[PDB]
From a paper:
As the exact epitope and mechanism are crucial elements for antibody drugs, we report the crystal structures of checkpoint molecules in complex with the Fab fragments of therapeutic antibodies approved by the FDA or currently undergoing clinical trials, and reveal the binding modes of the complexes and the conformational changes induced by the antibody binding, thereby providing a structural basis of checkpoint blockade by monoclonal antibodies for the treatment of cancer. In summary, the elucidation of the crystal structures of the checkpoint molecules PD-1, PD-L1 and CTLA-4 in complex with the Fab fragments of therapeutic antibodies sheds light on the molecular mechanisms underlying the therapeutic activity of these monoclonal antibodies. Blockade of the ligand-receptor interaction of these immune checkpoint molecules can directly enhance the function of T-cells, which represents a critical paradigm shift whereby checkpoint blockade aims at disinhibition of the activity of T-cells compared with the previous immuno-oncology concept, whereby cancer vaccines and cytokine therapies aimed at de novo activation of immune responses. Monoclonal antibodies blocking immune checkpoints have demonstrated unprecedented therapeutic benefits in clinical trials and provided a major breakthrough in oncology.
The FDA approved nivolumab for the treatment of melanoma in December 2014, NSCLC in March 2015, renal cell carcinoma in November 2015, and Hodgkin lymphoma in May 2016. The PD-1/nivolumab Fab complex and free nivolumab Fab fragment were crystallized and their structures were determined and refined to a resolution of 3.3 and 1.9 Å, respectively. The structural comparisons of the Fv regions of pembrolizumab and nivolumab before and after binding to PD-1 show little deviation in the conformation of the CDRs and minor adjustments in the side chains involved in the interaction with PD-1, implying that these antibody drugs maintain the CDR loops in productive binding conformations prior to interaction with PD-1.
Author numbering:
A (entry chain H): 2 to 209
B (entry chain L): 1 to 211
Write the structure that this text describes.
Amino acid sequence: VQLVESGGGVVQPGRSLRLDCKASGITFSNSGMHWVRQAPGKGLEWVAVIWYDGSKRYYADSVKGRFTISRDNSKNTLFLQMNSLRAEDTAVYYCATNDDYWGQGTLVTVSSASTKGPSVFPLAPSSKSTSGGTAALGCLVKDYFPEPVTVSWNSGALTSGVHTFPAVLQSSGLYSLSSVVTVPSSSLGTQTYICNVNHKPSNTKVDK
Amino acid sequence: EIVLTQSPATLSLSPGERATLSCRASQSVSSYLAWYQQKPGQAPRLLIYDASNRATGIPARFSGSGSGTDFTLTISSLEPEDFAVYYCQQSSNWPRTFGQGTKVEIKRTVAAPSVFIFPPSDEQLKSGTASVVCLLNNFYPREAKVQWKVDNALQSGNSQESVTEQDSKDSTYSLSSTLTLSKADYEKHKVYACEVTHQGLSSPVTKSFNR
Protein backbone atom coordinates (compact mmCIF):
# COMPACT_ATOMS: atom_id res chain seq x y z
CA VAL A 1 0.00 0.00 0.00
CA GLN A 2 1.58 3.21 -1.25
CA LEU A 3 0.43 6.81 -1.74
CA VAL A 4 2.95 8.86 -3.71
CA GLU A 5 2.53 12.61 -4.06
CA SER A 6 4.09 15.06 -6.50
CA GLY A 7 3.59 18.55 -7.89
CA GLY A 8 4.92 20.67 -5.04
CA GLY A 9 7.43 23.47 -5.42
CA VAL A 10 7.96 27.20 -5.12
CA VAL A 11 5.21 29.22 -6.77
CA GLN A 12 4.56 32.94 -6.84
CA PRO A 13 1.40 34.27 -5.15
CA GLY A 14 -1.64 34.52 -7.41
CA ARG A 15 -0.55 31.56 -9.55
CA SER A 16 -2.03 28.07 -9.86
CA LEU A 17 -0.57 24.65 -9.02
CA ARG A 18 -1.79 21.05 -9.37
CA LEU A 19 -0.82 18.36 -6.86
CA ASP A 20 -0.95 14.65 -7.72
CA CYS A 21 -1.33 11.61 -5.49
CA LYS A 22 -0.91 8.16 -7.04
CA ALA A 23 -2.04 5.09 -5.18
CA SER A 24 -0.77 1.53 -5.31
CA GLY A 25 -1.94 -1.62 -3.57
CA ILE A 26 -5.49 -0.56 -2.72
CA THR A 27 -8.95 -0.76 -4.27
CA PHE A 28 -8.66 2.97 -5.12
CA SER A 29 -11.93 3.07 -7.05
CA ASN A 30 -13.67 2.14 -3.81
CA SER A 31 -11.95 4.60 -1.47
CA GLY A 32 -12.88 8.09 -0.39
CA MET A 33 -9.84 10.40 -0.55
CA HIS A 34 -8.84 13.57 1.30
CA TRP A 35 -6.33 16.36 1.11
CA VAL A 36 -4.94 17.67 4.42
CA ARG A 37 -2.30 20.38 4.80
CA GLN A 38 0.13 21.64 7.40
CA ALA A 39 1.81 25.03 7.48
CA PRO A 40 5.43 24.99 8.70
CA GLY A 41 5.52 24.57 12.47
CA LYS A 42 1.74 24.35 12.69
CA GLY A 43 -1.09 21.84 12.99
CA LEU A 44 -3.07 19.67 10.61
CA GLU A 45 -5.95 21.22 8.64
CA TRP A 46 -8.44 19.36 6.44
CA VAL A 47 -8.72 20.73 2.89
CA ALA A 48 -11.16 18.58 0.88
CA VAL A 49 -12.67 15.16 0.32
CA ILE A 50 -13.93 13.30 -2.73
CA TRP A 51 -16.19 10.23 -2.74
CA TYR A 52 -14.91 6.97 -4.21
CA ASP A 53 -16.76 7.48 -7.52
CA GLY A 54 -16.20 11.23 -7.69
CA SER A 55 -19.91 11.92 -7.28
CA LYS A 56 -19.56 14.10 -4.17
CA ARG A 57 -16.92 16.58 -2.97
CA TYR A 58 -16.69 18.83 0.09
CA TYR A 59 -14.25 21.63 0.85
CA ALA A 60 -12.82 23.74 3.67
CA ASP A 61 -14.40 27.23 3.55
CA SER A 62 -11.05 28.87 2.91
CA VAL A 63 -10.56 27.02 -0.39
CA LYS A 64 -14.15 26.94 -1.73
CA GLY A 65 -14.39 28.53 -5.19
CA ARG A 66 -10.62 28.35 -5.43
CA PHE A 67 -9.44 24.70 -5.13
CA THR A 68 -10.86 21.65 -6.92
CA ILE A 69 -10.43 18.06 -5.83
CA SER A 70 -10.82 15.41 -8.53
CA ARG A 71 -9.69 11.93 -9.41
CA ASP A 72 -8.81 9.68 -12.31
CA ASN A 73 -9.66 6.20 -11.10
CA SER A 74 -8.26 4.73 -14.33
CA LYS A 75 -4.86 6.13 -13.33
CA ASN A 76 -5.37 5.57 -9.57
CA THR A 77 -4.64 9.27 -9.16
CA LEU A 78 -6.05 11.98 -6.91
CA PHE A 79 -5.64 15.66 -7.86
CA LEU A 80 -5.77 18.99 -6.11
CA GLN A 81 -6.02 21.92 -8.56
CA MET A 82 -5.24 25.12 -6.69
CA ASN A 83 -5.81 28.73 -7.76
CA SER A 84 -4.91 32.23 -6.55
CA LEU A 85 -2.31 31.04 -4.06
CA ARG A 86 -1.25 33.25 -1.13
CA ALA A 87 1.38 33.02 1.62
CA GLU A 88 -1.42 31.53 3.73
CA ASP A 89 -1.40 28.46 1.45
CA THR A 90 2.27 27.61 2.06
CA ALA A 91 2.17 24.09 3.54
CA VAL A 92 2.97 20.43 3.20
CA TYR A 93 -0.05 18.87 1.47
CA TYR A 94 -0.92 15.26 2.33
CA CYS A 95 -3.29 12.90 0.58
CA ALA A 96 -5.05 10.34 2.74
CA THR A 97 -7.51 7.53 2.15
CA ASN A 98 -10.66 7.69 4.24
CA ASP A 99 -9.39 4.66 6.17
CA ASP A 100 -6.23 6.69 6.89
CA TYR A 101 -3.31 5.56 4.77
CA TRP A 102 -1.36 8.81 4.29
CA GLY A 103 1.02 9.96 1.56
CA GLN A 104 4.51 11.33 2.32
CA GLY A 105 3.44 14.93 1.66
CA THR A 106 4.56 17.44 -0.94
CA LEU A 107 5.71 20.96 -0.02
CA VAL A 108 4.07 24.02 -1.54
CA THR A 109 5.95 27.29 -0.94
CA VAL A 110 4.24 30.51 -2.00
CA SER A 111 6.69 33.41 -2.31
CA SER A 112 7.28 36.53 -4.40
CA ALA A 113 10.94 36.79 -3.43
CA SER A 114 13.65 35.61 -5.83
CA THR A 115 15.14 32.22 -5.05
CA LYS A 116 18.84 31.94 -4.23
CA GLY A 117 21.08 28.87 -4.11
CA PRO A 118 23.34 28.22 -1.11
CA SER A 119 27.07 28.56 -0.71
CA VAL A 120 28.45 25.35 0.80
CA PHE A 121 31.56 25.24 3.00
CA PRO A 122 33.32 22.32 4.70
CA LEU A 123 33.49 22.05 8.48
CA ALA A 124 36.65 20.18 9.45
CA PRO A 125 38.86 20.19 12.56
CA SER A 126 42.14 22.12 12.42
CA SER A 127 44.50 19.30 11.42
CA LYS A 128 43.72 15.57 11.35
CA SER A 129 45.43 14.98 14.68
CA THR A 130 42.38 15.06 16.91
CA SER A 131 42.63 15.12 20.67
CA GLY A 132 40.28 12.13 20.87
CA GLY A 133 38.87 9.00 19.24
CA THR A 134 35.83 10.81 17.86
CA ALA A 135 35.98 13.50 15.20
CA ALA A 136 33.26 15.78 13.84
CA LEU A 137 32.92 16.95 10.25
CA GLY A 138 30.26 19.09 8.66
CA CYS A 139 29.15 21.53 6.02
CA LEU A 140 27.94 25.08 6.33
CA VAL A 141 25.04 25.70 3.95
CA LYS A 142 24.88 29.47 3.74
CA ASP A 143 22.63 32.20 2.33
CA TYR A 144 19.77 30.52 0.49
CA PHE A 145 16.10 31.26 -0.12
CA PRO A 146 13.57 29.89 0.36
CA GLU A 147 13.57 26.87 2.68
CA PRO A 148 14.27 23.98 2.53
CA VAL A 149 17.62 22.44 1.83
CA THR A 150 18.16 18.72 2.44
CA VAL A 151 21.52 17.12 3.23
CA SER A 152 22.79 13.56 3.01
CA TRP A 153 26.24 12.11 3.62
CA ASN A 154 27.99 9.74 1.20
CA SER A 155 24.75 9.57 -0.83
CA GLY A 156 22.77 8.23 2.14
CA ALA A 157 25.25 5.49 3.02
CA LEU A 158 26.21 7.48 6.10
CA THR A 159 23.32 8.11 8.48
CA SER A 160 24.36 7.20 12.02
CA GLY A 161 25.73 10.19 13.94
CA VAL A 162 24.32 12.71 11.45
CA HIS A 163 22.67 15.91 12.69
CA THR A 164 21.25 18.49 10.31
CA PHE A 165 20.28 21.67 12.12
CA PRO A 166 17.09 23.67 11.59
CA ALA A 167 17.79 26.68 9.41
CA VAL A 168 18.33 30.09 10.95
CA LEU A 169 16.99 33.26 9.31
CA GLN A 170 19.66 35.91 8.82
CA SER A 171 19.53 39.71 8.75
CA SER A 172 20.12 39.10 5.04
CA GLY A 173 16.59 37.73 4.92
CA LEU A 174 18.30 34.55 3.77
CA TYR A 175 18.66 31.17 5.49
CA SER A 176 21.70 29.31 6.79
CA LEU A 177 22.20 25.91 8.39
CA SER A 178 24.86 23.29 8.98
CA SER A 179 24.95 19.52 8.87
CA VAL A 180 27.44 17.64 10.99
CA VAL A 181 28.44 14.04 11.52
CA THR A 182 30.65 12.36 14.12
CA VAL A 183 33.01 9.60 12.93
CA PRO A 184 35.99 7.66 14.29
CA SER A 185 39.20 9.71 14.22
CA SER A 186 40.98 6.64 12.87
CA SER A 187 38.82 6.81 9.73
CA LEU A 188 40.20 10.27 8.97
CA GLY A 189 42.47 9.57 6.01
CA THR A 190 40.95 6.19 5.22
CA GLN A 191 37.35 7.18 4.49
CA THR A 192 36.08 9.89 2.14
CA TYR A 193 33.33 12.08 3.56
CA ILE A 194 31.06 13.99 1.21
CA CYS A 195 27.99 16.01 2.08
CA ASN A 196 25.24 16.08 -0.54
CA VAL A 197 23.39 19.39 -0.47
CA ASN A 198 20.10 19.82 -2.38
CA HIS A 199 18.15 23.07 -2.79
CA LYS A 200 15.34 22.29 -5.21
CA PRO A 201 13.95 25.86 -5.37
CA SER A 202 17.16 27.09 -7.05
CA ASN A 203 17.93 23.83 -8.86
CA THR A 204 21.16 23.60 -6.85
CA LYS A 205 23.05 20.46 -5.82
CA VAL A 206 26.51 20.65 -4.22
CA ASP A 207 28.84 17.96 -2.86
CA LYS A 208 31.54 19.22 -0.45
CA GLU B 1 -17.55 23.62 13.07
CA ILE B 2 -16.69 21.13 15.80
CA VAL B 3 -13.81 22.52 17.85
CA LEU B 4 -11.33 20.03 19.31
CA THR B 5 -9.23 21.15 22.28
CA GLN B 6 -6.27 19.02 23.30
CA SER B 7 -4.51 19.13 26.66
CA PRO B 8 -1.90 19.54 27.89
CA ALA B 9 -0.11 21.46 25.10
CA THR B 10 3.14 19.75 26.05
CA LEU B 11 3.75 16.63 28.09
CA SER B 12 7.22 15.75 29.30
CA LEU B 13 7.70 12.24 30.69
CA SER B 14 10.43 9.64 31.22
CA PRO B 15 10.56 6.35 29.34
CA GLY B 16 8.46 3.75 31.15
CA GLU B 17 6.00 6.34 32.43
CA ARG B 18 2.28 6.24 31.66
CA ALA B 19 1.15 9.10 29.43
CA THR B 20 -2.42 10.40 29.33
CA LEU B 21 -3.50 12.79 26.55
CA SER B 22 -6.90 14.53 26.48
CA CYS B 23 -9.15 15.69 23.64
CA ARG B 24 -12.39 17.59 24.22
CA ALA B 25 -14.99 18.35 21.55
CA SER B 26 -17.30 21.42 21.59
CA GLN B 27 -20.16 19.07 20.80
CA SER B 28 -20.77 15.33 20.79
CA VAL B 29 -18.99 13.48 18.03
CA SER B 30 -20.22 10.16 19.41
CA SER B 31 -17.28 7.78 18.84
CA TYR B 32 -16.10 9.30 15.53
CA LEU B 33 -12.73 10.31 16.93
CA ALA B 34 -9.26 9.20 15.85
CA TRP B 35 -5.76 9.74 17.22
CA TYR B 36 -2.62 10.29 15.12
CA GLN B 37 1.09 10.29 15.85
CA GLN B 38 3.38 12.61 13.92
CA LYS B 39 7.14 12.22 14.34
CA PRO B 40 9.55 14.90 13.09
CA GLY B 41 9.75 15.08 9.31
CA GLN B 42 7.09 12.41 8.85
CA ALA B 43 3.49 12.10 7.77
CA PRO B 44 0.90 11.52 10.52
CA ARG B 45 0.13 7.90 11.37
CA LEU B 46 -3.22 6.56 12.59
CA LEU B 47 -3.01 5.11 16.13
CA ILE B 48 -6.62 4.76 17.26
CA TYR B 49 -9.90 4.97 15.34
CA ASP B 50 -13.54 5.06 16.48
CA ALA B 51 -12.23 6.36 19.86
CA SER B 52 -10.88 3.02 21.11
CA ASN B 53 -9.90 0.67 18.25
CA ARG B 54 -6.15 0.15 17.70
CA ALA B 55 -5.09 0.55 14.05
CA THR B 56 -3.03 -1.96 12.09
CA GLY B 57 0.55 -2.46 13.22
CA ILE B 58 0.11 -0.20 16.24
CA PRO B 59 1.86 -1.39 19.47
CA ALA B 60 -0.27 -2.59 22.41
CA ARG B 61 0.95 0.24 24.67
CA PHE B 62 -1.36 2.61 22.77
CA SER B 63 -5.04 2.66 23.73
CA GLY B 64 -7.94 5.09 23.54
CA SER B 65 -11.16 5.71 25.40
CA GLY B 66 -14.15 8.00 25.41
CA SER B 67 -17.34 8.94 23.62
CA GLY B 68 -19.41 12.08 23.19
CA THR B 69 -17.20 15.04 24.08
CA ASP B 70 -14.32 13.68 26.22
CA PHE B 71 -11.53 11.46 24.87
CA THR B 72 -8.24 10.08 26.11
CA LEU B 73 -5.19 8.56 24.42
CA THR B 74 -3.04 6.51 26.80
CA ILE B 75 0.52 5.34 26.28
CA SER B 76 0.85 2.73 29.00
CA SER B 77 4.65 2.73 29.00
CA LEU B 78 6.42 5.46 27.05
CA GLU B 79 9.39 4.81 24.76
CA PRO B 80 11.97 7.25 23.37
CA GLU B 81 10.59 6.58 19.86
CA ASP B 82 7.22 8.01 21.01
CA PHE B 83 8.67 11.53 20.77
CA ALA B 84 6.08 13.16 18.52
CA VAL B 85 3.10 15.45 18.28
CA TYR B 86 -0.23 13.69 18.80
CA TYR B 87 -3.46 14.92 17.19
CA CYS B 88 -7.13 13.99 17.50
CA GLN B 89 -9.53 14.30 14.54
CA GLN B 90 -13.33 14.07 14.50
CA SER B 91 -15.22 12.57 11.55
CA SER B 92 -18.75 13.19 12.85
CA ASN B 93 -19.32 15.92 10.31
CA TRP B 94 -17.87 18.35 7.79
CA PRO B 95 -15.49 20.05 7.87
CA ARG B 96 -13.20 17.43 9.39
CA THR B 97 -11.42 19.13 12.31
CA PHE B 98 -8.22 18.40 14.26
CA GLY B 99 -7.07 19.33 17.72
CA GLN B 100 -4.07 21.61 17.93
CA GLY B 101 -1.81 18.75 18.95
CA THR B 102 0.00 17.69 22.11
CA LYS B 103 3.77 17.51 21.93
CA VAL B 104 5.11 14.57 23.92
CA GLU B 105 8.71 15.19 24.95
CA ILE B 106 10.97 12.60 26.55
CA LYS B 107 12.49 13.27 29.99
CA ARG B 108 15.79 11.40 29.96
CA THR B 109 18.70 11.71 32.38
CA VAL B 110 21.41 14.36 32.33
CA ALA B 111 23.99 13.96 29.55
CA ALA B 112 26.97 16.27 29.00
CA PRO B 113 27.71 17.68 25.55
CA SER B 114 30.69 16.63 23.47
CA VAL B 115 32.08 19.94 22.20
CA PHE B 116 33.80 20.59 18.85
CA ILE B 117 35.08 23.84 17.31
CA PHE B 118 35.46 24.56 13.56
CA PRO B 119 37.61 27.33 12.04
CA PRO B 120 36.41 29.22 8.93
CA SER B 121 37.37 27.35 5.76
CA ASP B 122 39.37 27.93 2.63
CA GLU B 123 36.68 29.23 0.29
CA GLN B 124 34.36 31.07 2.69
CA LEU B 125 37.02 33.61 3.41
CA LYS B 126 37.35 34.40 -0.34
CA SER B 127 34.00 36.09 0.18
CA GLY B 128 34.45 38.81 2.80
CA THR B 129 33.10 36.83 5.78
CA ALA B 130 34.24 34.36 8.47
CA SER B 131 32.04 31.76 10.17
CA VAL B 132 33.41 29.84 13.13
CA VAL B 133 31.18 27.07 14.43
CA CYS B 134 30.89 25.51 17.86
CA LEU B 135 29.14 22.15 18.05
CA LEU B 136 27.55 20.73 21.22
CA ASN B 137 26.64 17.14 20.53
CA ASN B 138 24.21 14.67 22.12
CA PHE B 139 23.29 16.33 25.40
CA TYR B 140 20.36 16.78 27.83
CA PRO B 141 18.61 18.92 29.01
CA ARG B 142 18.24 21.40 26.18
CA GLU B 143 19.42 24.44 28.14
CA ALA B 144 23.10 25.14 27.53
CA LYS B 145 25.22 28.26 27.72
CA VAL B 146 27.76 28.94 25.01
CA GLN B 147 30.19 31.85 25.25
CA TRP B 148 32.53 33.00 22.50
CA LYS B 149 35.94 34.42 23.37
CA VAL B 150 38.38 36.12 21.04
CA ASP B 151 41.59 36.83 22.98
CA ASN B 152 39.63 36.28 26.18
CA ALA B 153 37.23 39.02 25.09
CA LEU B 154 33.63 37.87 25.47
CA GLN B 155 31.54 38.31 22.32
CA SER B 156 27.99 39.61 21.99
CA GLY B 157 25.45 40.05 19.20
CA ASN B 158 27.61 38.26 16.65
CA SER B 159 26.44 34.66 17.07
CA GLN B 160 23.37 32.56 16.25
CA GLU B 161 22.31 29.24 17.74
CA SER B 162 20.29 26.37 16.31
CA VAL B 163 19.10 23.27 18.15
CA THR B 164 17.89 19.91 16.82
CA GLU B 165 14.72 18.15 17.83
CA GLN B 166 15.02 15.40 20.45
CA ASP B 167 16.68 12.25 19.03
CA SER B 168 14.17 9.42 18.57
CA LYS B 169 16.53 6.74 19.92
CA ASP B 170 18.46 8.41 22.76
CA SER B 171 16.34 11.54 23.41
CA THR B 172 19.33 13.93 23.36
CA TYR B 173 19.74 17.29 21.61
CA SER B 174 22.58 18.76 19.60
CA LEU B 175 23.26 22.49 19.20
CA SER B 176 25.33 24.67 16.94
CA SER B 177 26.58 28.18 17.65
CA THR B 178 27.95 30.17 14.74
CA LEU B 179 30.06 33.28 15.31
CA THR B 180 29.96 35.41 12.17
CA LEU B 181 32.60 38.04 11.51
CA SER B 182 34.11 39.93 8.57
CA LYS B 183 37.14 38.17 7.00
CA ALA B 184 39.30 41.16 7.81
CA ASP B 185 38.24 41.07 11.46
CA TYR B 186 39.05 37.32 11.59
CA GLU B 187 42.73 38.34 11.30
CA LYS B 188 42.98 41.11 13.86
CA HIS B 189 42.89 38.11 16.25
CA LYS B 190 44.61 34.79 16.98
CA VAL B 191 42.71 32.89 19.66
CA TYR B 192 39.16 31.63 19.07
CA ALA B 193 37.37 29.75 21.83
CA CYS B 194 33.93 28.39 22.61
CA GLU B 195 33.22 27.91 26.36
CA VAL B 196 30.28 25.68 27.36
CA THR B 197 28.38 25.32 30.61
CA HIS B 198 25.66 22.73 31.08
CA GLN B 199 23.95 20.70 33.82
CA GLY B 200 25.93 17.64 32.71
CA LEU B 201 29.35 19.23 33.26
CA SER B 202 31.03 19.62 36.65
CA SER B 203 33.19 22.40 35.20
CA PRO B 204 33.06 24.57 32.07
CA VAL B 205 34.47 23.03 28.89
CA THR B 206 36.42 25.16 26.43
CA LYS B 207 37.43 24.24 22.89
CA SER B 208 39.77 26.55 21.02
CA PHE B 209 42.08 27.06 18.06
CA ASN B 210 44.77 29.51 17.01
CA ARG B 211 44.91 31.74 13.88
